[PDB]
């Protein structure tokens, strides 16, 4: 697509292998924000969106949070809190013709800056002067979309770059997009490490009496730690009790007297560790 | 040096056709918008039309029926094929480049470089 | 196809009380037996909610603002309310959002519809009449889903538009109250999040005619507006929001907001601060004396030749450039490196004429 | 457009030599790895060999004794000089580029563009 | 440590970088102390073929 009319595709209900994209040498720009690129296969994502367009070579700097320019302000705005990856690569052999490829256009003029992830395809005549256009071109009245002149002889920076922006939401809804890690069996009533949809932790998994609403995946306690979780394969609720922690106190006489010690496990029953309760 | 030279004006009969040129030097039309503007002896500059870099044409809606703006990018020149020239079509025709880039101040016409313009008159002989 | 409805009866729209309605779940996280404070676009408690009727001859499809968000309540029987229209100009110039629920399915489309002045559905006494738009040329988003839907049914919806995301929250309530909004509390579950990415400032309710002219079936709806504010929500042992506190409604609930509790012990509690908002701006700058002698430069009797061009230093004076730029005497006025209207806002050194 | 054209197949006597071509258009061999693969009528694709950009050759170790892969970078073409063609050397010979840079699909053969392939048969006449 | 890399891969000779050169050829530690010096050698390390 053009950048003013950037295409958005929903990615859902699939397993995404980002190791074949990040390790590919085809992409000249690969900038991830709010997530590490090597941690992508270990997370599960909800609401994955792929925005695709073609921009100029030196305008790839403007596809980032907090940038200013014609592309950021008038064509494609990213939020300051953006999480996702911006992937760009040179497409001079595909999107340039010898006379000039004019199929890619950008919005040069607008009355106000775009909101984040807002698309403007309106083609009203812009007023760059004092006299109103009344929808008709004239002095200081222009068509707002101008086309790139894409030729193969142009230097790098005036050459077309195909830009795909991936956008994720991190672990707040039930997730439909996951990396290729295989699932193991579900083990309950034991102190185990757990990885539920990219949510890592350590605890004991027990059957829960809580009834989650269908838009809810996990539950948080006072300290915003996940104390209840829904298993993504069999839709059941599990309490996550933290693995048993007990303060250890070393009862001793002086080392001048003896080296014998006793140990106290505070608030710990004797069957979960000269035994005295 | 960026310089716009027009040619092709002169006497022309009523109801005929007359082709005008805007042979440009110092710049090409692959990345610039080009406009045609007329000038009556008793009135101001009146905008005729505009050629974009992708080939898109816009015209004056009171003058669409009798003007045609075309390019010849191999010869980097602009063409204006006017037809049915009447008495009010007597004008001095300027060809100018549009300023879509940085403008140092407010421009009434929005042109960064102008042409010398060619004069066309319509009468009996 | 469009049809003007010319048998309406003129009547102003009504107003009533919101009570404690419009509360939705702020996130998708389960919370139990907790008091959670959240700052979001909420509907204020006991607010002035606008009331529109469909009765026979009332048929209320006006043009309403969207503002920051819309709470939409519906006291509905026999299925007259069918969908909504969102946009800015509601024509083919801009891009508009269509949500409909016809006799088969729920359709969401983001297209440049050329909307009718009176968009409607129709039931013949079966659905065989649909006049909402006359064209649809450039469509970016399509989404076909399940059916969302004495007055017997209560429909609450919350429409929000943040960061190109349209959040729709919904709640369905069995009621048996005749005329007005029931007084109670019901937290709205999230229904759908749509990546529409369009500007929305105006919206339309879509109704359905009954034909046997036209007849309007008995229905009533309510429009309220969301404001950014803080609620203290109470989550019970079952994870359901059972009560809420508006933190800026009255000083008692503001004390409940400050103490993070729904019960307040007897005493005095410093809860807030009273401040007096500024009303005007007063800028006082000293007398504009010692004008620069531009009258001695522009209105001089003799001027120099170009080979022997005269140079005059202008310094230690206040220069009014607004009388030069707005003067019609000068045929050429070309400024380089500075805007002519920004000249009075700058101070200059080494001025030469 | 990236397009691989092979030529040189046909009838060939037992024990002779036959030279095949992979005249390429749309890309050059200065930065790409190129492979030759055969195809029996009753068996699958069998990899013959690979030419790297630096001139490095690798072959099928059951087929090293009778194949030779060379380049002509001035004519941007690949050559395959096969000798001592027997009955089982009847094959349709594809020339393909190796997609070292990217793996869009989990390709079993690991090639992104193929050739049409040329057919070679070995018999009495 | 001396080597020859591509012109646009000099970005990857830094602590914490990823790429073919950093991950597969030359890894710098995150606690690296020292100086990375690079210069164009097109007249020395390029031939016409
Ligand atoms: C229904 O009524 C509306 C309001 O009068 C009509 O909209 C107007 O139509 C005329 C016809 O050309 C236009 O000149 C006006 O500009 C329209 N008004 C607005 C505000 O745009 C509408 O056309 C009527 N429906 C039908 C089918 O005629
Ligand atoms: C959205 O529309 C309103 C009115 O139609 C306008 O004032 C506002 O600037 C628009 N927003 C953007 C980002 O263009
Ligand atoms: C697969 O997962 C779905 C929901 O994610 C569940 O309904 C189904 O029972 C699962 N099947 C197996 C074999 O685990
Ligand atoms: C609601 O608004 C109307 C006019 O906007 C006003 O007359 C009415 O008094 C308001 N109701 C309340 C309860 O303030
Ligand atoms: C409801 O709308 C959809 C979308 O256009 C359409 O396919 C379907 O036929 C409609 N059903 C009825 C009963 O109008
Ligand atoms: C919108 O539709 C009109 C008419 O169908 C078309 O000319 C225009 O190119 C379209 N715009 C986009 C961005 O598709
Ligand atoms: C919570 O649910 C239980 C049944 O699981 C029910 O007995 C109890 O009354 C409920 N409490 C509330 C406050 O709804
Ligand atoms: C020059 O004279 C004209 C004549 O009216 C006057 O209006 C103008 O203010 C004078 N110029 C200046 C700079 O004072
Ligand atoms: C990628 O596209 C090219 C041409 O569009 C095609 O030849 C190639 O097979 C495609 N690759 C895959 C893996 O589909």
Numbering used by the authors:
A (entry chain C): 348 to 620, 641 to 644
B (entry chain F), D (entry chain E): 22 to 146
C (entry chain A): 14 to 69, 77 to 145, 153 to 176, 185 to 247, 257 to 397
E (entry chain B): 398 to 446
According to the publication:
The most prominent mutations are in the spike protein, which mediates entry of the virus into cells by engaging with the angiotensin converting enzyme 2 (ACE2) receptor. Despite being phylogenetically distinct, a common feature of both the UK and South African variants is the mutation of residue 501 in the RBD from Asn to Tyr (N501Y). X-ray crystallography and cryo-electron microscopy (cryo-EM) structural studies have identified N501 as a key residue in the spike protein at the interface between RBD and ACE2 that is involved in critical contacts with several ACE2 residues. Mutations that emerge in the receptor binding domain (RBD) of the spike protein are especially of interest given their high potential to alter the kinetics and strength of the interaction of the virus with target cells.
To understand the effects of these antibodies at a structural level, we next determined cryo-EM structures of the complexes formed by VH ab8 (variable domain of the bivalent fusion construct VH FC Ab8) and Fab ab1 (the antigen binding fragment of IgG ab1) with the N501Y mutant spike protein ectodomain. Cryo-EM structural analysis of the complex formed between VH ab8 and the N501Y spike protein ectodomain shows a single dominant conformation with 2 VH ab8 fragments bound to RBDs in the down conformation and weak density for the other RBD, which is flexible and primarily in the up position. The global average resolution of the map is approximately 2.8 Å, with lower local resolution in the RBD regions, but local refinement yields maps of the VH ab8–RBD interface at a resolution of approximately 3 Å. The structure has 2 receptor binding domains (RBDs) in the down position with well-resolved densities for the bound VH ab8. The third RBD is in the up position. Residue 501 of the spike protein RBD is at the periphery of the footprint of VH ab8 and shows no evidence of interactions with the antibody. The presence of the mutation thus appears not to influence interactions between the RBD and VH ab8. In cryo-EM experiments, Fab ab1 also binds the RBD in only the up position, but in contrast, the much smaller VH ab8 fragment binds the RBD in both up and down positions. ELISA analysis of IgG ab1 and VH Fc ab8 interactions with unmutated or N501Y spike ectodomains demonstrates that the N501Y mutation has no significant effect on VH Fc ab8 binding but results in a slightly higher EC50 for IgG ab1. Our results suggest that despite the higher infectivity of SARS-CoV-2 viruses carrying the N501Y mutation, the availability of the extended epitope surface on the RBD enables effective neutralization by VH ab8 and Fab ab1.
